[PDB]
Amino acid sequence: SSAEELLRRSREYLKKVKEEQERKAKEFQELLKELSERSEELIRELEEKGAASEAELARMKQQHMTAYLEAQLTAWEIESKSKIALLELQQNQLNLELRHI
Amino acid sequence: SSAEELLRRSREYLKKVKEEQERKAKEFQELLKELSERSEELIRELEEKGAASEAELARMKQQHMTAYLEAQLTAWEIESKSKIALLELQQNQLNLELRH
Amino acid sequence: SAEELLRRSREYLKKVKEEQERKAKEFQELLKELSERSEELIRELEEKGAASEAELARMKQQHMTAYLEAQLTAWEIESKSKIALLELQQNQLNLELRH
Amino acid sequence: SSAEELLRRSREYLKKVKEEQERKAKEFQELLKELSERSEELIRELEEKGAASEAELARMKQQHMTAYLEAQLTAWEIESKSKIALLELQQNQLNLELRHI
Amino acid sequence: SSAEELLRRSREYLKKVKEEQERKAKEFQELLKELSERSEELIRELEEKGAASEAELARMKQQHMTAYLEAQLTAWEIESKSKIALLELQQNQLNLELRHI
Amino acid sequence: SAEELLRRSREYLKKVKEEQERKAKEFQELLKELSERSEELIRELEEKGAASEAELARMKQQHMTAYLEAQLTAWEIESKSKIALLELQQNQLNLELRH
Amino acid sequence: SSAEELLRRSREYLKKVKEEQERKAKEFQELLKELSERSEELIRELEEKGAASEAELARMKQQHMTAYLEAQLTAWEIESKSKIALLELQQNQLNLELRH
Amino acid sequence: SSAEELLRRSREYLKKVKEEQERKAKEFQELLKELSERSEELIRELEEKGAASEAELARMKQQHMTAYLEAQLTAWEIESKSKIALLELQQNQLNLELRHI
């Protein structure tokens, strides 16, 4: 009863954290999408202006793609690590309930 | 009773740790906001002066956005790790409460 | 009740594992696309003589070096992810036999 | 009795380690503040003397903020990892206290 | 009986994960070999055409070996971490087998 | 016999903890020395006008930036080291009470 | 008996893992030796030609020694981590053998 | 008896690893000492030749001290991590003996 209430509060508190992680993951993708499209807009403007040397933009383009690639890998590593860690806490939570209940 | 004291004390201390980490998270967003808002202001100044080449300001702006993104990812990594460890510590606490 | 929770626990486990396969596949598609763009940019340069022979060598090697770094990183992620869930799959299996 | 003595001693040595880390955290903040204020001083002297181009100073100023943001994150990472790790040891200490004595 | 089925299945899924990592390890070596041989090709063309100074080529050649050494260490780090981690899971699987069935 | 092993186990534990304090102190002495050398080199430059005002600013900031990085690194090491042994000290204390 | 088979099989497999890691350690020292011996040869060639400034070869030599030192530290970190993990795994194995 | 023999073999095997770590630590310090003194010999030669600009050597010197500082920190981190990990295996070894024994 009282144990059922605490385990209840712990389970629903665990879900808010899980949903809180899903929020941050989406928020990052939106941020990266905006920044990446701002960078492409900058590089595109140069190509229109022709201000940047053909080699200059090639180096600029490859840096944009490289950092974007790097940004995704980091976000992939973070969310992957978070989801897996929460899952173990989901198992501990379940282990507590069955054993007690 | 005496065990009720210690376990209640631990719960409240965990509560303080959780709040201090929420502070540091918010404080960082405020710091990153200010500094980032300065960096955008500097690049604005350079644009209006035309004190940097068109390509150079493309490089500076993209470096600015790259560092902001790196910073957000790092703070996201720290807070995500903190919240989940405390979550495990809170489970140990809960298990003890149940144990008693 | 114990079976329902554990069955529901295995389903969420399955979704997480499946999702991790989703991201790994998506990355390889992203890597190939960006990789094929990068070699296209390098293609155009050499054809136009835009970059010096020394310049294109450093550019090509930067591209291969970045591609190798990307794979090793994605390898480390997917490798660690799969093994971490693998311990959770064993934790799940241990819970089931417990009942 | 000796269990109580050994465990009370444990409680104190662990209270000292915790205070030691609060001390190190403050010292770094004072350290970063002093050095970070030299940087602004060196830079203000440049802007005053006009000894760096408008872009050089902007690159220097954003370099300073970028390094400052990294120092805070890195210090935040250490103190956070330390506080959480010590927290778990206090839990073990608390578990022994309920058991051993 | 069902324990034996669940555990034998576990044994097989874990044998598949192990073979999968031996596969990934080889693929990388083939991958590194192909790209690493392009680098030597691009560089041999430079030395032939004399399109880089004596020092530039030396800096490029030592750059190539330095990156190659990093790729091996990094791949060695991953495969080693993977093999050891899987090894422990095989031990848990072996522990269950002695117990559950 | 159990007491001898555990007493001997605590002595080796003590040596390791003491040794870790030795390295932490030694590093701060190394850092200060190298740091004081570096600021001496920078001192000589500005006095001789060897480096431009812009040059010395970047040099000074590189030195402070490297010093900060060194401290954070040594902080992370000594902090992690002490906590890791602290769990081993608790493991030792748990073994003793077990007897 | 049947348990004696499995635990003996695990001991021999652990034995193979320990040996494969000794291989990789030695193989790396051989690779680092060759490449490092090439790098020293290149800098020798440059010295005899006088194809690089005196200061430049000081920078190149010091970069060469820095990378060799970084490489050794990394391989030292990998093997030190591997040997100690297997050592823990070998202890789990031993505990099982004792358990039976 | 037979257990006393296996635990014996495990304890002495643990000591060879511990001594093996002490070897690598010393070996590194010797290597760093030699390389560091080779670098100082190079920088010293330049100052005698005066080949390097007074600012050039100042940058060169600071890089030598910085990398040396970095090298020590890495070695400090490795040996510290190794010694602590071996110690836990020393505790597990002792725990196995007393319990069996």
Instruction: Show Cβ contacts of residue F34 under 8 Å, excluding neighbours closer than 6 positions.
Output: H65, H68, H69
Nearest C-alpha in C relative to E94: C90
Work out the angle at residue G53's Cα, subtended by the Cα atoms of residues G48 and G58, and round it to the nearest 5 degrees. Answer: 85
Of A45, D76, A81, D69, the C-alpha closest to B66 is: D69
**Using CB atoms within 10 A of its CB, is residue E52 exposed (0-12), middle (13-18) or buried (19+)?**
buried
Which helix (H) or strand (E) covers residue D85, if one does? Answer: helix D54-100
Structure tokens at D17: 């380690």
Residue B82: count of CB within 10 angstroms of its CB: 23
Helix axes H54-99, F2-48, angle to 10 degrees: 170
Give which of H73, H82, H92 to mutate to test F binding, by max F Cβ within 10 Å. Answer: H73
Q: Contact at 8 Å (CB) between A91 and B89? A: no
How many whole angstroms separate alpha carbon H91 and alpha carbon F10? Answer: 10
Residue C69: count of CB within 10 angstroms of its CB: 18
Give which of D86, D87, D88, D95 to mutate to test B binding, by max B Cβ within 10 Å. Answer: D87
The resolution, in angstroms to one decimal, equals 2.4
**Using CB atoms within 10 A of its CB, is residue B16 exposed (0-12), middle (13-18) or buried (19+)?**
exposed
Structure tokens at D57: 């100073």
Instruction: Tell me the one-letter amino acid at C90.
Output: Q
Record: contact A10-B55, CB cut-off 8 A: no
Residue G70: count of CB within 10 angstroms of its CB: 18
**Using CB atoms within 10 A of its CB, is residue D34 exposed (0-12), middle (13-18) or buried (19+)?**
exposed
Instruction: Tell me the one-letter amino acid at A76.
Output: W
Structure tokens at C25: 């596949």
Q: Contact at 8 Å (CB) between H73 and F73? A: yes
Instruction: Tell me the one-letter amino acid at D81.
Output: K
The distance of E84 to chain G (nearest Cα, Å) reads 7
Instruction: Tell me the one-letter amino acid at F7.
Output: R
Instruction: Tell me the one-letter amino acid at A50.
Output: G
Of H89, C71, D74, E32, the C-alpha closest to G84 is: H89
**Which residues from A are below 8 Å from B when comparing CB atoms?**
3, 6-7, 10, 14, 17, 20-21, 24, 28, 31-32, 35, 38-39, 42-43, 45-46, 49, 51-52, 56, 60, 63-64, 67, 71, 74-75, 78, 81-82, 85-86, 89, 92-93, 96, 100
Long-range CB contacts (within 8 A, 24+) of C8-14: C9/A90, C9/A91, C9/A94, C9/C92, C9/C95, C10/C92, C10/C96, C12/A87, C12/A90, C13/A87, C13/C85, C13/C88, C13/C89, C13/C92
The experimental method, as deposited, was: X-ray
Distances (CA, A) of C50 to A63, C37, D56, G87, H49: 18, 17, 29, 57, 41
Phi, psi dihedral angles at B96 (to 5 degrees): -65, -45
Phi, psi dihedral angles at B53 (to 5 degrees): -55, 155
Q: Contact at 8 Å (CB) between E96 and C89? A: no
Question: What separation, in Å, do the N-terminal and C-terminal C-alpha atoms of chain F show?
Answer: 11
Instruction: Show Cβ contacts of residue A68 under 8 Å, excluding neighbours closer than 6 positions.
Output: A32, A36, C34
How many whole angstroms separate alpha carbon C66 and alpha carbon D79? Answer: 33
Q: Would you list the domain boundaries of chain H?
A: 1-101
Q: Contact at 8 Å (CB) between A24 and B76? A: yes
Token pair 């869930």: residue? C85
**Which residues from A are below 8 Å from C when comparing CB atoms?**
53-55, 58-59, 61-62, 65-66, 68-69, 72-73, 76-77, 80, 83-84, 87-88, 90-91, 94-95, 97-98
Residue D64: count of CB within 10 angstroms of its CB: 18
DSSP letter for each residue of E18-68: HHHHHHHHHHHHHHHHHHHHHHHHHHHHHHHHT-S-HHHHHHHHHHHHHHH
Distances (CA, A) of H2 to D6, H5, H7, H100, H101: 36, 5, 9, 11, 11
How many whole angstroms separate alpha carbon D3 and alpha carbon F6? Answer: 16
How many whole angstroms separate alpha carbon E80 and alpha carbon F2? Answer: 38
The four Cα atoms F37, F39, F43, F49 give a dihedral, to 10 degrees, of 110
Structure tokens at D36: 């970070």
Instruction: Tell me the one-letter amino acid at C47.
Output: E
Q: Contact at 8 Å (CB) between H83 and F77? A: no
How many whole angstroms separate alpha carbon H3 and alpha carbon G93? Answer: 13
Which helix (H) or strand (E) covers residue D99, if one does? Answer: helix D54-100
DSSP letter for each residue of B27-84: HHHHHHHHHHHHHHHHHHHHHHHT-S-HHHHHHHHHHHHHHHHHHHHHHHHHHHHHHH
DSSP letter for each residue of chain F: -HHHHHHHHHHHHHHHHHHHHHHHHHHHHHHHHHHHHHHHHHHHHHHHT-S-HHHHHHHHHHHHHHHHHHHHHHHHHHHHHHHHHHHHHHHHHHHHHH-
Percentage helix, strand, coil for chain A under 3-state DSSP, each rounded to 5: 95, 0, 5
Q: What is the DSSP letter of A22?
A: H
Structure tokens at A67: 């950092």
Gaps (C–N > 2.5 Å) in chain G: which residues precede them? none
How many whole angstroms separate alpha carbon G52 and alpha carbon G43? Answer: 9
How many whole angstroms separate alpha carbon G84 and alpha carbon B49? Answer: 60
Against chain H, the chains showing at least 3 CB pairs within 8 Å are: F, G
Phi-psi map region of B52: left, alpha, beta (phi>0 left; psi -120 to 50 alpha): beta
Q: Contact at 8 Å (CB) between E73 and G28? A: yes
Distances (CA, A) of B65 to A40, B61, C27: 12, 6, 22
Among the partner residues F2, F66, F88, nearest to H98 by beta-carbon distance: F2
Q: What is the DSSP letter of D52?
A: S
